[PDB]
């Protein structure tokens, strides 16, 4: 019986709380503590699609031997589901992936849910310290953002990007590897198409860097690229709205809308392919997934004092 773990939650005092405990009895467990960990991290709004896409991407690594790891096109969803409250912070799945690589050691699966809003100035340093120990522990950062990508979801991100830069350990190449813009209800497949190609021109005009743009829009496109070692864009089509106005959405396969399976069908392996695997790396090092846990505690504890 798997399912999802807090591992970080912010408590009404604005105080940053790690279960240690949960961290160890997942990570540290002997069948999986000594291996070289992939973390794939899902972060965004509150209700913007995040659980609906990683019970999809537990649906891959269970099934990843499997042609339509999807599920039967006639029949409800099948599987472990993250959709079981409105938590600001991190959750882990208890369960850890062990993949062989092309090669032959096994390489560990970690995914996490970062969830958090920066709506008020109130809420911001909380969302911006969990958005943060979530960019610093994962290998792919999924900036899951709704219909486009506007300036403001850019200030956020230059925003705990900072916050993890100086509680880091200096470096001289960049301190993160891979960020991922993920836009989930993209309505203009006539301008780019969906999938990553069209999230390649995409947010290569977005993030483009002009001298007819603002100090301030040009100085926070420096930033996000000066922070990733790679930066790419994923453009999703809706769902559908059976899915859209569903809560906790139990319905067919076939009730989901076709070109949405379509590029969730790759998606889902463009992300979590063995071949695509990138062993974590912090100042230059492959982490395992020991040492995760490790810089886990080590980073959160410098938020606090
Ligand atoms: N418009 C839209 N709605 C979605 C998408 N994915 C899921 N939904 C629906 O929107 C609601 C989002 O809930 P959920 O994803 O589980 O919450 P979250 O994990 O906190 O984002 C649910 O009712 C889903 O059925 C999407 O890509 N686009
Ligand atoms: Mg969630």
């Given at each position: 019986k798997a399912g999802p773990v807090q591992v970080l939650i912010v408590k009404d005092d604005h105080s940053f709380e790690l279960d240690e405990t949960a961290l160890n009895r997942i990570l540290l467990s002997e069948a999986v503590r000594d291996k070289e960990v992939v973390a794939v991290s899902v972060a965004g709004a509150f209700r913007k699609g995040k659980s609906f896409l990683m019970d999809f991407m537990l649906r891959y690594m269970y099934n990843?031997?499997?042609?339509?790891?999807?599920?039967?096109?006639?029949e409800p969803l099948t599987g472990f589901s993250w959709r079981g409250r409105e938590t600001t912070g991190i959750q882990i799945w208890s369960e850890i992936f062990l993949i062989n690589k092309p090669d032959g050691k096994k390489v560990a699966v970690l995914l996490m849910d970062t969830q958090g809003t920066f709506?008020?100035?109130?809420?911001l340093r909380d969302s911006a310290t969990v958005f943060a120990l979530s960019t610093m522990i994962s290998?792919?950062?999924?900036?899951?953002?709704?219909?486009n990508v506007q300036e403001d979801d850019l200030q956020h991100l230059q925003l705990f990007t900072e916050y993890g830069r100086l509680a880091m350990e200096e470096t001289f190449l960049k301190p993160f590897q891979s960020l991922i813009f993920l836009v989930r209800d993209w309505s203009f497949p006539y301008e780019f198409s969906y999938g990553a190609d069209g999230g390649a021109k995409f947010l290569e005009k977005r993030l483009k860097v002009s001298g007819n743009q603002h100090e301030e829009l040009q100085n926070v496109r420096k930033h996000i690229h000066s922070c990733f070692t790679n930066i790419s864009c994923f453009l999703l089509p809706h769902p559908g709205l059976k899915v859209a106005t569903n809560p906790n959405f139990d319905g067919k396969l076939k009730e989901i809308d076709d070109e949405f399976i379509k590029n969730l069908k790759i998606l889902i392996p463009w992300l979590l392919s063995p071949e695509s695997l990138d062993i974590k790396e912090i100042n230059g090092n492959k982490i395992t997934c020991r040492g995760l846990v490790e810089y886990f505690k080590a980073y959160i504890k410098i938020y606090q004092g």
């Amino acid at each position: 019986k798997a399912g999802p773990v807090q591992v970080l939650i912010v408590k009404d005092d604005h105080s940053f709380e790690l279960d240690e405990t949960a961290l160890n009895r997942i990570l540290l467990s002997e069948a999986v503590r000594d291996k070289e960990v992939v973390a794939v991290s899902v972060a965004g709004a509150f209700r913007k699609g995040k659980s609906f896409l990683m019970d999809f991407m537990l649906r891959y690594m269970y099934n990843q031997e499997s042609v339509d790891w999807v599920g039967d096109y006639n029949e409800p969803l099948t599987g472990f589901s993250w959709r079981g409250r409105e938590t600001t912070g991190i959750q882990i799945w208890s369960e850890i992936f062990l993949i062989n690589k092309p090669d032959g050691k096994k390489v560990a699966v970690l995914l996490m849910d970062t969830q958090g809003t920066f709506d008020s100035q109130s809420t911001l340093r909380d969302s911006a310290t969990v958005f943060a120990l979530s960019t610093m522990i994962s290998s792919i950062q999924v900036y899951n953002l709704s219909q486009n990508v506007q300036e403001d979801d850019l200030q956020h991100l230059q925003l705990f990007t900072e916050y993890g830069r100086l509680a880091m350990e200096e470096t001289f190449l960049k301190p993160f590897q891979s960020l991922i813009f993920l836009v989930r209800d993209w309505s203009f497949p006539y301008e780019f198409s969906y999938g990553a190609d069209g999230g390649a021109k995409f947010l290569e005009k977005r993030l483009k860097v002009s001298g007819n743009q603002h100090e301030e829009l040009q100085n926070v496109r420096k930033h996000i690229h000066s922070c990733f070692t790679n930066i790419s864009c994923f453009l999703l089509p809706h769902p559908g709205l059976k899915v859209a106005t569903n809560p906790n959405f139990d319905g067919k396969l076939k009730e989901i809308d076709d070109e949405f399976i379509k590029n969730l069908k790759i998606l889902i392996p463009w992300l979590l392919s063995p071949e695509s695997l990138d062993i974590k790396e912090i100042n230059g090092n492959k982490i395992t997934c020991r040492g995760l846990v490790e810089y886990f505690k080590a980073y959160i504890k410098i938020y606090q004092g």
